[PDB]
Amino acid sequence: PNAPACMERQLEAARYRSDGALLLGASSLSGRCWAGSLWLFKDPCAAPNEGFCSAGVQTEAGVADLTWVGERGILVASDSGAVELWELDENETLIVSKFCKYEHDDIVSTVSVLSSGTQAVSGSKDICIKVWDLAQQVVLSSYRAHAAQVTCVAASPHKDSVFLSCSEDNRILLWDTRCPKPASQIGCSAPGYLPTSLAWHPQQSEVFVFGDENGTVSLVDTKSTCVLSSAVHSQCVTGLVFSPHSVPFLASLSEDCSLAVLDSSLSELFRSQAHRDFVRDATWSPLNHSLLTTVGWDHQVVHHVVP
Amino acid sequence: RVSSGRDLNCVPEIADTLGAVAKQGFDFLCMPVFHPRFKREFIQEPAKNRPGPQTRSDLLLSGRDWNTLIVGKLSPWIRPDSKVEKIRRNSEAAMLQELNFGAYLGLPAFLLPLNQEDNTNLARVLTNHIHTGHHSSMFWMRVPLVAPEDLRDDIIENAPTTHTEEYSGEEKTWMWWHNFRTLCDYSKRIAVALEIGADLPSNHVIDRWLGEPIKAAILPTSIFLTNKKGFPVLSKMHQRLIFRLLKLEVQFIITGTNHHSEKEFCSYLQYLEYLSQNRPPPNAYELFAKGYEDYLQSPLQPLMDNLESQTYEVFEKDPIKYSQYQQAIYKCLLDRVPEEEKDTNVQVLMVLGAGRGPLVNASLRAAKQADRRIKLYAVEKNPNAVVTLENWQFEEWGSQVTVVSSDMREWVAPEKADIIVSELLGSFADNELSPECLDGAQHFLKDDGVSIPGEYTSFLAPISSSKLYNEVRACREKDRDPEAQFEMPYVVRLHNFHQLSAPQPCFTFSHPNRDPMIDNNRYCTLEFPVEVNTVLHGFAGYFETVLYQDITLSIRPETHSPGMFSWFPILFPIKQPITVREGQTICVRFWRCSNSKKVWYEWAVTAPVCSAIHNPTGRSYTIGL
Ligand SMILES: *CCNc1ncnc2c1ccn2[C@@H]1O[C@H]([C@H](O)c2ccc(Cl)cc2)[C@@H](O)[C@H]1O
């Protein structure tokens, strides 16, 4: 279908669109050529099989993070130092470079689209965070707040000027581009383990969660100052995605190659040993809220049914 | 021309990327050898049993290209000093794997970061790699002038950037290196790759890196300003640092993506090239020095040893030396021979240690321009040199010059002298034993006689050079005290070093020596005010001499006779380096010692801490009488 024959071994990203069609990011982290690729699968259960898919394209380089820009566009965190925007044609057969801007100085590691959907914020190993204009194809502002690699940036669900970030400098920063000093440190008292993953609560604008490198997921209420925390994983918490459910569930992924699903009080409901390598993403079906799809570096696309 | 390389942390195809890089003008590439994001598990099932190749094949380049064009890069997820045990353990295995792969490929160097204070386990692992056989690779420790925490934008509202000065705090990156290199026991395979930021620190912080083994300077694309035509350039302060770095012959590494997208990427490199071309060119002193920088040598002992033909030739090719000796003799003859006696009075002029005759010729050339008459004696103990004198004498000088083939202390003279002339001086003035010689030669000087030179003074200054300390440290030899190399002076063109205090005089001698009971033994105490934090590794020696009246010679930098490249400085090392904090005084003690066969130096530091006395009883170093 106009794409590569072989897709790269190491699956980085997995994101459902509002209608139910699966977005896939893949890089090759070993072998002769170290690049990546983008893939659309209108059949969720056909993935990751290449020739029986809706669309596909090769990127010059790997793919550390991506996310949807609405319904047609795909925002990409490259190893090249590029934020790139790829957008589908009207037929949804091709995937076309819309822009590719080489603005970070090291690998771009995390990206998250803001609530307007016309702006986005990327984070990198060069220690910077950048706010982008997706119409104009430019960096509006560039912020060096951290002292180490920026591990994760997450846009506020609804407020276009607010987002979280976290870094190997042990800081969790709440940003608010309206304030003249936009960043603000959210000390969890001690120098407790480094923050690895972030997720805003989708129904409470005051709440978020974060995972650490020691496998602990934590519940934070912005202002109060670390309500609760559970030792969910035995290794680094790679990602956190809240479900679209009314009182939502929290999927937690890790380098112990295990998915977990958690409730309001971070108690364990589901657990999946299905992957044999690192679990890199999670995305809940907007057509079936019991369904949850994970990718890994074992090249599996598992589909879990959650009670 | 500059030796310069490209840093990337993303290489999809080695083949193409290397070609692209060579095209742009770079000499080498810094790249990962496993994919930077490819985190690997070594203990936990299931991830540990991850199949597939762990990286790309060594077949992708020629062994030659691997040896010459590639600098390895530690993967940035490898954190041997994490607070999480599981990560420390993986990171150990990972570091080892990546380093053992670096050595497998035969890479000429391999980068590791110093980016926090505690690098103890990182040092432990690297060190262990170094002692797993005697393979020769280098390790470049990537360390920034300014820690990233101290250059962050002032944008966290509840955590502002400290606006007060912190003298010691601002040097903290130096101490990260110091701790790290101290732990690895001053390995010669561990050098610095110094990363330069957008805003430079205060001068003292940059001055800390004087003396350190900087093999590389990393310049991010982001630090480059833009001139009116859109090309990338650098601030004048950044240019100063680059000019300093070019004297250290460092390899320049360019890191980051292109920010000047209006122009292509060879421009950044072409700027450095332009800056290399446009330095102040190599002066008349620094043309000869080139080659001999921080190269340790034995000080000559032309008394005990007979100097070689090419050795005489070196110290002869120095016209400043002899025009000053000519001038000092010119002036002396006039002061002793009134114009009315310019034919009756013939001055008895003895060159003591005549070599192959350049001071004889300078003595002739001087007696011509003064229009006085001179009877010359040329004493030389080196019978090989005396061959050259007696051939000169028969072919040219006639019996104006009596050549005497003798030690000047053995010689019974036919007549007393009006002027004794000599060049028995070494880089520390008295280190060839000019005092002892001219004392034994004093009995055949007229009651009113002159010595040229009449006076010389040695000078000392404390220095920091972790480079030279290691250089000395490397002079261990079988069948002698394993610390002997530290208890002896070297002559050396001191280059990568920091002078910690103004030179101060140490030992002075006078000829003729009036003083009834003489004694050339000596004891001197010097106090050196030091205004920086630093590490003391030794004392540089220099000297000044008065030939006659205002006519002088000097290698003391502050009064150097311009263009006198003969004599390099001397270096007295010490065994253990001594921390010196800004405001402290370094007190050093020097003795000149002797018995009837040997003369030698001994020395110690007494402040801020005591060293051992170095070279006691001349056990490791003596100068032969
Ligand atoms: C000082 C005791 N004995 C003595 N007698 C005669 N000649 C002596 C000597 C000690 C050193 N020398 C001669 O002095 C010359 C001098 O060191 C020198 C070195 C280089 C040059 Cl280019 C000119 C002169 C040597 O020729 C040495 O043998």
PDB file of N, CA, C and O in Angstrom, chain A residues 12 27 29-34 63-64 79-80 102-107 144 147 149 171 181 183-185 193 234 255 276-277 297, chain B residues 9-13 34-35 37-39 46 50 53-56 76 84 86 148-149 153-159 221 256-257 259:
ATOM      1  N   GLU A  12       7.579   1.958  19.140  1.00  0.00           N
ATOM      2  CA  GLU A  12       7.644   3.009  20.145  1.00  0.00           C
ATOM      3  C   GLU A  12       6.282   3.536  20.604  1.00  0.00           C
ATOM      4  O   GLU A  12       6.069   3.744  21.804  1.00  0.00           O
ATOM      5  N   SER A  27      10.837   2.455  15.366  1.00  0.00           N
ATOM      6  CA  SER A  27      12.233   2.758  15.028  1.00  0.00           C
ATOM      7  C   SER A  27      13.000   1.442  14.985  1.00  0.00           C
ATOM      8  O   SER A  27      12.543   0.450  15.562  1.00  0.00           O
ATOM      9  N   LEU A  29      16.419   0.223  16.450  1.00  0.00           N
ATOM     10  CA  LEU A  29      17.456   0.543  17.429  1.00  0.00           C
ATOM     11  C   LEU A  29      18.709  -0.361  17.296  1.00  0.00           C
ATOM     12  O   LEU A  29      19.671  -0.231  18.077  1.00  0.00           O
ATOM     13  N   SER A  30      18.689  -1.268  16.313  1.00  0.00           N
ATOM     14  CA  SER A  30      19.822  -2.123  16.000  1.00  0.00           C
ATOM     15  C   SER A  30      19.915  -2.405  14.500  1.00  0.00           C
ATOM     16  O   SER A  30      18.961  -2.167  13.749  1.00  0.00           O
ATOM     17  N   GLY A  31      21.069  -2.915  14.075  1.00  0.00           N
ATOM     18  CA  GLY A  31      21.296  -3.290  12.679  1.00  0.00           C
ATOM     19  C   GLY A  31      21.800  -2.149  11.815  1.00  0.00           C
ATOM     20  O   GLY A  31      21.871  -1.013  12.259  1.00  0.00           O
ATOM     21  N   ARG A  32      22.133  -2.480  10.570  1.00  0.00           N
ATOM     22  CA  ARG A  32      22.779  -1.575   9.602  1.00  0.00           C
ATOM     23  C   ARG A  32      22.253  -0.142   9.608  1.00  0.00           C
ATOM     24  O   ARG A  32      23.027   0.811   9.721  1.00  0.00           O
ATOM     25  N   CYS A  33      20.939  -0.022   9.455  1.00  0.00           N
ATOM     26  CA  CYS A  33      20.265   1.251   9.255  1.00  0.00           C
ATOM     27  C   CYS A  33      19.369   1.551  10.476  1.00  0.00           C
ATOM     28  O   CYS A  33      18.575   0.704  10.888  1.00  0.00           O
ATOM     29  N   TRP A  34      19.535   2.742  11.062  1.00  0.00           N
ATOM     30  CA  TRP A  34      18.865   3.139  12.306  1.00  0.00           C
ATOM     31  C   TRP A  34      17.879   4.253  12.015  1.00  0.00           C
ATOM     32  O   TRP A  34      18.189   5.429  12.184  1.00  0.00           O
ATOM     33  N   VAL A  63      12.116   7.333  15.987  1.00  0.00           N
ATOM     34  CA  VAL A  63      10.876   7.910  16.442  1.00  0.00           C
ATOM     35  C   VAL A  63      10.791   7.637  17.938  1.00  0.00           C
ATOM     36  O   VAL A  63      10.437   6.529  18.352  1.00  0.00           O
ATOM     37  N   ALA A  64      11.145   8.649  18.733  1.00  0.00           N
ATOM     38  CA  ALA A  64      11.132   8.551  20.201  1.00  0.00           C
ATOM     39  C   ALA A  64       9.727   8.732  20.785  1.00  0.00           C
ATOM     40  O   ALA A  64       9.346   8.033  21.735  1.00  0.00           O
ATOM     41  N   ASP A  79      15.011  11.391  16.504  1.00  0.00           N
ATOM     42  CA  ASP A  79      16.419  11.389  16.954  1.00  0.00           C
ATOM     43  C   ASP A  79      17.271  12.496  16.312  1.00  0.00           C
ATOM     44  O   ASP A  79      18.278  12.919  16.893  1.00  0.00           O
ATOM     45  N   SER A  80      16.877  12.957  15.120  1.00  0.00           N
ATOM     46  CA  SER A  80      17.630  13.961  14.380  1.00  0.00           C
ATOM     47  C   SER A  80      17.693  15.328  15.056  1.00  0.00           C
ATOM     48  O   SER A  80      18.504  16.163  14.654  1.00  0.00           O
ATOM     49  N   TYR A 102      14.655  21.267  12.200  1.00  0.00           N
ATOM     50  CA  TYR A 102      15.799  20.832  13.001  1.00  0.00           C
ATOM     51  C   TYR A 102      16.156  21.910  14.017  1.00  0.00           C
ATOM     52  O   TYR A 102      17.072  22.704  13.788  1.00  0.00           O
ATOM     53  N   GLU A 103      15.423  21.924  15.133  1.00  0.00           N
ATOM     54  CA  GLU A 103      15.516  23.002  16.127  1.00  0.00           C
ATOM     55  C   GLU A 103      16.146  22.618  17.482  1.00  0.00           C
ATOM     56  O   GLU A 103      16.772  23.472  18.120  1.00  0.00           O
ATOM     57  N   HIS A 104      15.960  21.370  17.929  1.00  0.00           N
ATOM     58  CA  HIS A 104      16.685  20.832  19.097  1.00  0.00           C
ATOM     59  C   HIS A 104      18.115  20.404  18.732  1.00  0.00           C
ATOM     60  O   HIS A 104      18.407  20.046  17.587  1.00  0.00           O
ATOM     61  N   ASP A 105      19.003  20.444  19.719  1.00  0.00           N
ATOM     62  CA  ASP A 105      20.429  20.165  19.502  1.00  0.00           C
ATOM     63  C   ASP A 105      20.841  18.707  19.737  1.00  0.00           C
ATOM     64  O   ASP A 105      21.920  18.299  19.325  1.00  0.00           O
ATOM     65  N   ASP A 106      19.979  17.940  20.395  1.00  0.00           N
ATOM     66  CA  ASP A 106      20.176  16.522  20.629  1.00  0.00           C
ATOM     67  C   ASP A 106      18.821  15.877  20.263  1.00  0.00           C
ATOM     68  O   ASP A 106      17.926  16.554  19.739  1.00  0.00           O
ATOM     69  N   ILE A 107      18.683  14.582  20.536  1.00  0.00           N
ATOM     70  CA  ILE A 107      17.445  13.837  20.330  1.00  0.00           C
ATOM     71  C   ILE A 107      16.242  14.522  20.969  1.00  0.00           C
ATOM     72  O   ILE A 107      16.287  14.911  22.134  1.00  0.00           O
ATOM     73  N   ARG A 144      15.045  26.878  28.574  1.00  0.00           N
ATOM     74  CA  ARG A 144      16.022  26.031  29.293  1.00  0.00           C
ATOM     75  C   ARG A 144      15.811  26.127  30.815  1.00  0.00           C
ATOM     76  O   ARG A 144      16.538  26.812  31.517  1.00  0.00           O
ATOM     77  N   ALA A 147      18.184  21.113  34.156  1.00  0.00           N
ATOM     78  CA  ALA A 147      19.642  20.897  34.198  1.00  0.00           C
ATOM     79  C   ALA A 147      20.096  19.582  33.544  1.00  0.00           C
ATOM     80  O   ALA A 147      21.286  19.412  33.262  1.00  0.00           O
ATOM     81  N   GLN A 149      18.502  15.983  30.881  1.00  0.00           N
ATOM     82  CA  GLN A 149      17.567  15.570  29.831  1.00  0.00           C
ATOM     83  C   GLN A 149      16.135  15.795  30.280  1.00  0.00           C
ATOM     84  O   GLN A 149      15.788  15.491  31.430  1.00  0.00           O
ATOM     85  N   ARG A 171      13.448  17.459  38.831  1.00  0.00           N
ATOM     86  CA  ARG A 171      12.369  18.442  38.907  1.00  0.00           C
ATOM     87  C   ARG A 171      11.117  17.972  38.168  1.00  0.00           C
ATOM     88  O   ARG A 171      11.212  17.421  37.069  1.00  0.00           O
ATOM     89  N   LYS A 181       7.633  34.433  34.851  1.00  0.00           N
ATOM     90  CA  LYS A 181       8.459  33.247  35.083  1.00  0.00           C
ATOM     91  C   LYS A 181       7.545  32.019  34.912  1.00  0.00           C
ATOM     92  O   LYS A 181       6.875  31.601  35.858  1.00  0.00           O
ATOM     93  N   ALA A 183       7.694  28.739  34.595  1.00  0.00           N
ATOM     94  CA  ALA A 183       7.849  27.437  35.247  1.00  0.00           C
ATOM     95  C   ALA A 183       7.636  27.525  36.746  1.00  0.00           C
ATOM     96  O   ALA A 183       7.784  28.588  37.326  1.00  0.00           O
ATOM     97  N   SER A 184       7.298  26.397  37.360  1.00  0.00           N
ATOM     98  CA  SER A 184       7.138  26.322  38.809  1.00  0.00           C
ATOM     99  C   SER A 184       7.374  24.900  39.310  1.00  0.00           C
ATOM    100  O   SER A 184       6.716  23.968  38.869  1.00  0.00           O
ATOM    101  N   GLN A 185       8.305  24.762  40.250  1.00  0.00           N
ATOM    102  CA  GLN A 185       8.742  23.465  40.774  1.00  0.00           C
ATOM    103  C   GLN A 185       7.701  22.932  41.745  1.00  0.00           C
ATOM    104  O   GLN A 185       7.168  23.703  42.540  1.00  0.00           O
ATOM    105  N   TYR A 193      13.052   9.528  43.940  1.00  0.00           N
ATOM    106  CA  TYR A 193      13.583   9.055  42.647  1.00  0.00           C
ATOM    107  C   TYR A 193      13.096   9.841  41.429  1.00  0.00           C
ATOM    108  O   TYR A 193      12.008  10.437  41.440  1.00  0.00           O
ATOM    109  N   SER A 234       8.510  -3.069  39.136  1.00  0.00           N
ATOM    110  CA  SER A 234       9.860  -3.361  39.642  1.00  0.00           C
ATOM    111  C   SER A 234      10.947  -2.573  38.896  1.00  0.00           C
ATOM    112  O   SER A 234      12.103  -2.558  39.324  1.00  0.00           O
ATOM    113  N   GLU A 255       9.606  -1.130  32.127  1.00  0.00           N
ATOM    114  CA  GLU A 255      10.724  -1.861  31.568  1.00  0.00           C
ATOM    115  C   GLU A 255      10.857  -3.236  32.231  1.00  0.00           C
ATOM    116  O   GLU A 255      11.777  -4.002  31.898  1.00  0.00           O
ATOM    117  N   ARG A 276       7.368  -9.731  26.034  1.00  0.00           N
ATOM    118  CA  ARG A 276       8.678 -10.289  26.410  1.00  0.00           C
ATOM    119  C   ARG A 276       9.836  -9.265  26.290  1.00  0.00           C
ATOM    120  O   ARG A 276      10.990  -9.619  26.516  1.00  0.00           O
ATOM    121  N   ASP A 277       9.517  -8.014  25.939  1.00  0.00           N
ATOM    122  CA  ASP A 277      10.464  -6.892  25.958  1.00  0.00           C
ATOM    123  C   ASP A 277       9.733  -5.632  26.484  1.00  0.00           C
ATOM    124  O   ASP A 277       8.588  -5.716  26.924  1.00  0.00           O
ATOM    125  N   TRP A 297       8.914  -3.501  22.408  1.00  0.00           N
ATOM    126  CA  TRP A 297      10.105  -3.769  21.581  1.00  0.00           C
ATOM    127  C   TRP A 297      10.213  -5.231  21.138  1.00  0.00           C
ATOM    128  O   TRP A 297      10.994  -5.555  20.247  1.00  0.00           O
TER     129      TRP A 297
ATOM    130  N   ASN B   9      24.481  12.651  17.696  1.00  0.00           N
ATOM    131  CA  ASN B   9      23.887  11.604  18.504  1.00  0.00           C
ATOM    132  C   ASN B   9      22.801  10.846  17.696  1.00  0.00           C
ATOM    133  O   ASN B   9      22.011  10.097  18.266  1.00  0.00           O
ATOM    134  N   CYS B  10      22.795  11.026  16.370  1.00  0.00           N
ATOM    135  CA  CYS B  10      21.890  10.321  15.465  1.00  0.00           C
ATOM    136  C   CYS B  10      22.588  10.034  14.125  1.00  0.00           C
ATOM    137  O   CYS B  10      22.946  10.966  13.391  1.00  0.00           O
ATOM    138  N   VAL B  11      22.779   8.747  13.824  1.00  0.00           N
ATOM    139  CA  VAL B  11      23.424   8.288  12.585  1.00  0.00           C
ATOM    140  C   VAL B  11      22.608   7.116  12.032  1.00  0.00           C
ATOM    141  O   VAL B  11      22.766   5.979  12.503  1.00  0.00           O
ATOM    142  N   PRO B  12      21.714   7.387  11.052  1.00  0.00           N
ATOM    143  CA  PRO B  12      20.915   6.293  10.502  1.00  0.00           C
ATOM    144  C   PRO B  12      21.727   5.368   9.605  1.00  0.00           C
ATOM    145  O   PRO B  12      21.488   4.167   9.631  1.00  0.00           O
ATOM    146  N   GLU B  13      22.682   5.914   8.845  1.00  0.00           N
ATOM    147  CA  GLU B  13      23.578   5.114   8.003  1.00  0.00           C
ATOM    148  C   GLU B  13      25.000   5.620   8.214  1.00  0.00           C
ATOM    149  O   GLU B  13      25.300   6.755   7.850  1.00  0.00           O
ATOM    150  N   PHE B  34      26.287   1.928  20.030  1.00  0.00           N
ATOM    151  CA  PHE B  34      24.979   1.310  20.140  1.00  0.00           C
ATOM    152  C   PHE B  34      24.014   2.479  20.062  1.00  0.00           C
ATOM    153  O   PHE B  34      24.380   3.589  20.437  1.00  0.00           O
ATOM    154  N   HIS B  35      22.793   2.242  19.581  1.00  0.00           N
ATOM    155  CA  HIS B  35      21.782   3.311  19.447  1.00  0.00           C
ATOM    156  C   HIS B  35      21.513   3.971  20.815  1.00  0.00           C
ATOM    157  O   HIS B  35      21.322   3.262  21.810  1.00  0.00           O
ATOM    158  N   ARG B  37      19.092   5.464  22.339  1.00  0.00           N
ATOM    159  CA  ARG B  37      17.858   5.084  23.028  1.00  0.00           C
ATOM    160  C   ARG B  37      17.719   3.598  23.358  1.00  0.00           C
ATOM    161  O   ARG B  37      16.778   3.239  24.062  1.00  0.00           O
ATOM    162  N   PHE B  38      18.641   2.746  22.894  1.00  0.00           N
ATOM    163  CA  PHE B  38      18.455   1.284  22.941  1.00  0.00           C
ATOM    164  C   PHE B  38      18.813   0.680  24.300  1.00  0.00           C
ATOM    165  O   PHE B  38      19.762  -0.058  24.432  1.00  0.00           O
ATOM    166  N   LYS B  39      18.016   0.978  25.309  1.00  0.00           N
ATOM    167  CA  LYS B  39      18.323   0.555  26.664  1.00  0.00           C
ATOM    168  C   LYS B  39      18.292  -0.975  26.744  1.00  0.00           C
ATOM    169  O   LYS B  39      17.426  -1.596  26.136  1.00  0.00           O
ATOM    170  N   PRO B  46      11.957 -10.936  31.399  1.00  0.00           N
ATOM    171  CA  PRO B  46      12.322 -11.428  30.067  1.00  0.00           C
ATOM    172  C   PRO B  46      13.315 -10.575  29.262  1.00  0.00           C
ATOM    173  O   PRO B  46      14.019 -11.122  28.407  1.00  0.00           O
ATOM    174  N   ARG B  50      16.513 -10.590  25.283  1.00  0.00           N
ATOM    175  CA  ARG B  50      16.269  -9.888  24.026  1.00  0.00           C
ATOM    176  C   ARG B  50      17.186 -10.413  22.934  1.00  0.00           C
ATOM    177  O   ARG B  50      18.402 -10.310  23.052  1.00  0.00           O
ATOM    178  N   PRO B  53      20.713  -8.692  16.815  1.00  0.00           N
ATOM    179  CA  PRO B  53      21.971  -7.974  17.079  1.00  0.00           C
ATOM    180  C   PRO B  53      21.773  -6.831  18.080  1.00  0.00           C
ATOM    181  O   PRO B  53      20.714  -6.192  18.077  1.00  0.00           O
ATOM    182  N   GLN B  54      22.768  -6.602  18.940  1.00  0.00           N
ATOM    183  CA  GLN B  54      22.706  -5.513  19.914  1.00  0.00           C
ATOM    184  C   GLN B  54      23.138  -4.198  19.268  1.00  0.00           C
ATOM    185  O   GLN B  54      22.747  -3.124  19.717  1.00  0.00           O
ATOM    186  N   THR B  55      23.932  -4.268  18.209  1.00  0.00           N
ATOM    187  CA  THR B  55      24.204  -3.080  17.415  1.00  0.00           C
ATOM    188  C   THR B  55      24.592  -3.450  15.996  1.00  0.00           C
ATOM    189  O   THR B  55      24.483  -4.612  15.606  1.00  0.00           O
ATOM    190  N   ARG B  56      25.026  -2.452  15.234  1.00  0.00           N
ATOM    191  CA  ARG B  56      25.465  -2.660  13.861  1.00  0.00           C
ATOM    192  C   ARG B  56      26.864  -3.288  13.763  1.00  0.00           C
ATOM    193  O   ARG B  56      27.643  -3.287  14.727  1.00  0.00           O
ATOM    194  N   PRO B  76      23.753   7.674  26.612  1.00  0.00           N
ATOM    195  CA  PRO B  76      23.460   8.634  27.681  1.00  0.00           C
ATOM    196  C   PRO B  76      22.510   8.133  28.764  1.00  0.00           C
ATOM    197  O   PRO B  76      22.338   8.814  29.775  1.00  0.00           O
ATOM    198  N   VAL B  84      19.449   4.178  42.237  1.00  0.00           N
ATOM    199  CA  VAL B  84      18.678   2.949  42.111  1.00  0.00           C
ATOM    200  C   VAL B  84      19.609   1.792  41.777  1.00  0.00           C
ATOM    201  O   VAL B  84      20.162   1.743  40.670  1.00  0.00           O
ATOM    202  N   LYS B  86      19.237  -1.292  40.794  1.00  0.00           N
ATOM    203  CA  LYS B  86      18.986  -1.969  39.523  1.00  0.00           C
ATOM    204  C   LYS B  86      19.643  -1.224  38.373  1.00  0.00           C
ATOM    205  O   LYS B  86      20.226  -1.847  37.501  1.00  0.00           O
ATOM    206  N   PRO B 148      25.417  22.712  33.891  1.00  0.00           N
ATOM    207  CA  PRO B 148      24.171  23.169  33.252  1.00  0.00           C
ATOM    208  C   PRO B 148      23.174  23.816  34.249  1.00  0.00           C
ATOM    209  O   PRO B 148      22.475  24.772  33.893  1.00  0.00           O
ATOM    210  N   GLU B 149      23.165  23.321  35.490  1.00  0.00           N
ATOM    211  CA  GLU B 149      22.414  23.918  36.610  1.00  0.00           C
ATOM    212  C   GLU B 149      22.735  25.388  36.863  1.00  0.00           C
ATOM    213  O   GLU B 149      21.871  26.122  37.320  1.00  0.00           O
ATOM    214  N   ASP B 153      18.063  29.091  32.310  1.00  0.00           N
ATOM    215  CA  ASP B 153      17.219  30.295  32.291  1.00  0.00           C
ATOM    216  C   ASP B 153      16.558  30.511  33.662  1.00  0.00           C
ATOM    217  O   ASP B 153      16.176  29.541  34.335  1.00  0.00           O
ATOM    218  N   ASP B 154      16.454  31.780  34.073  1.00  0.00           N
ATOM    219  CA  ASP B 154      15.896  32.163  35.387  1.00  0.00           C
ATOM    220  C   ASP B 154      14.376  32.270  35.293  1.00  0.00           C
ATOM    221  O   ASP B 154      13.799  33.370  35.390  1.00  0.00           O
ATOM    222  N   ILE B 155      13.737  31.111  35.124  1.00  0.00           N
ATOM    223  CA  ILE B 155      12.315  31.038  34.790  1.00  0.00           C
ATOM    224  C   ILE B 155      11.487  30.148  35.715  1.00  0.00           C
ATOM    225  O   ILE B 155      10.277  30.026  35.522  1.00  0.00           O
ATOM    226  N   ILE B 156      12.100  29.561  36.739  1.00  0.00           N
ATOM    227  CA  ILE B 156      11.332  28.852  37.748  1.00  0.00           C
ATOM    228  C   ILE B 156      11.058  29.887  38.833  1.00  0.00           C
ATOM    229  O   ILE B 156      11.984  30.398  39.456  1.00  0.00           O
ATOM    230  N   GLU B 157       9.782  30.210  39.023  1.00  0.00           N
ATOM    231  CA  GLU B 157       9.368  31.345  39.861  1.00  0.00           C
ATOM    232  C   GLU B 157       9.705  31.099  41.337  1.00  0.00           C
ATOM    233  O   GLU B 157      10.093  32.036  42.036  1.00  0.00           O
ATOM    234  N   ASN B 158       9.588  29.842  41.778  1.00  0.00           N
ATOM    235  CA  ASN B 158       9.843  29.453  43.183  1.00  0.00           C
ATOM    236  C   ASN B 158      11.202  28.763  43.375  1.00  0.00           C
ATOM    237  O   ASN B 158      11.377  27.948  44.287  1.00  0.00           O
ATOM    238  N   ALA B 159      12.153  29.094  42.502  1.00  0.00           N
ATOM    239  CA  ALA B 159      13.503  28.541  42.535  1.00  0.00           C
ATOM    240  C   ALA B 159      14.377  29.421  41.637  1.00  0.00           C
ATOM    241  O   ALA B 159      14.711  29.022  40.516  1.00  0.00           O
ATOM    242  N   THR B 221      26.683  24.529  18.288  1.00  0.00           N
ATOM    243  CA  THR B 221      26.188  25.473  17.279  1.00  0.00           C
ATOM    244  C   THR B 221      25.421  26.638  17.917  1.00  0.00           C
ATOM    245  O   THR B 221      25.513  27.780  17.448  1.00  0.00           O
ATOM    246  N   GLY B 256      25.558  19.722  17.888  1.00  0.00           N
ATOM    247  CA  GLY B 256      24.253  20.345  17.650  1.00  0.00           C
ATOM    248  C   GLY B 256      23.885  20.468  16.182  1.00  0.00           C
ATOM    249  O   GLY B 256      24.742  20.353  15.305  1.00  0.00           O
ATOM    250  N   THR B 257      22.598  20.711  15.936  1.00  0.00           N
ATOM    251  CA  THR B 257      22.048  20.882  14.589  1.00  0.00           C
ATOM    252  C   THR B 257      22.334  22.285  14.064  1.00  0.00           C
ATOM    253  O   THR B 257      22.769  23.164  14.822  1.00  0.00           O
ATOM    254  N   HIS B 259      21.547  25.852  13.223  1.00  0.00           N
ATOM    255  CA  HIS B 259      20.633  26.945  13.563  1.00  0.00           C
ATOM    256  C   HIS B 259      20.678  28.073  12.543  1.00  0.00           C
ATOM    257  O   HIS B 259      19.730  28.859  12.453  1.00  0.00           O
TER     258      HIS B 259
END
